[PDB]
Amino acid sequence: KVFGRCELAAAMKRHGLDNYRGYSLGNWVCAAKFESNFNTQATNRNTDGSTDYGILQINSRWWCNDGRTPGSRNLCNIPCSALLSSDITASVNCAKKIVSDGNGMNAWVAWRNRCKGTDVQAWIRGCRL
Numbered sequence: 001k002v003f004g005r006c007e008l009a010a011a012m013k014r015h016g017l018d019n020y021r022g023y024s025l026g027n028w029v030c031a032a033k034f035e036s037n038f039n040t041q042a043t044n045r046n047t048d049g050s051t052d053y054g055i056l057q058i059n060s061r062w063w064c065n066d067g068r069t070p071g072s073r074n075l076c077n078i079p080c081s082a083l084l085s086s087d088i089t090a091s092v093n094c095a096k097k098i099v100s101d102g103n104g105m106n107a108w109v110a111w112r113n114r115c116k117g118t119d120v121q122a123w124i125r126g127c128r129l
Contacts, residue, residue, distance in 0.1 A: 001086040003038040005029065006090075006127035014093040015128055021099050025129070026120030031111035032056060033123065040091075041084050054083035054091050057107065062092055094113070 003011070009029050011016070018025035033056040036042035044052040050061035050069045058076070060069040066080035076094035083091050098107050105111045 002041045003032075003040070005033075005038070005123070006129075008032060008055075009124055009127045009129060011088055012092065015089065017095075018090060020096065020129075021104070023105055024075055024120060024125040027105060027111065027115060029123040030115035030118070030120050031105060031108045034110035034114045035108055040086055040088065041106065043084070053080045056083075056090055056091050056095050057110075058091065058094055059097070060081055063098065096106070 002043060009025060012028050013025055017023075017028045018102070032038055032055050036055050040055050042054065042057065046052065046059075048061070050059055051066060051074070052059050053064065058064060058080075060066045060072055060080050062073050063076045064078050064080040065072060065074040067091065070117065071074070076097060078090060078094065081126060099105055105116070
């Protein structure tokens, strides 16, 4: 499923991401836009044997089990396939753990390269939240 911008913003706000750990809703929508372009089915294989899954591109080496990643841990206790559903609940709950893992949102490289330090409030324009 491909979310509309505000549609995703509403979904995230509904799951408690607005201002979570001090990160405004705009930061999460911006991270989603550049990590997967709002596509819940987006996947990106990395050269280390792991793969990134879903709207927030969560990595299989430490967060979810896809059964084909060497020395992988499953800290979010879920199959990576669950991160590819139209319902973002699984992704959000896992993301909440990742953002509290000691690196803030720096865990998402696309957020760091395209959102960090910018006027993220723009990603929430026109939305009736």
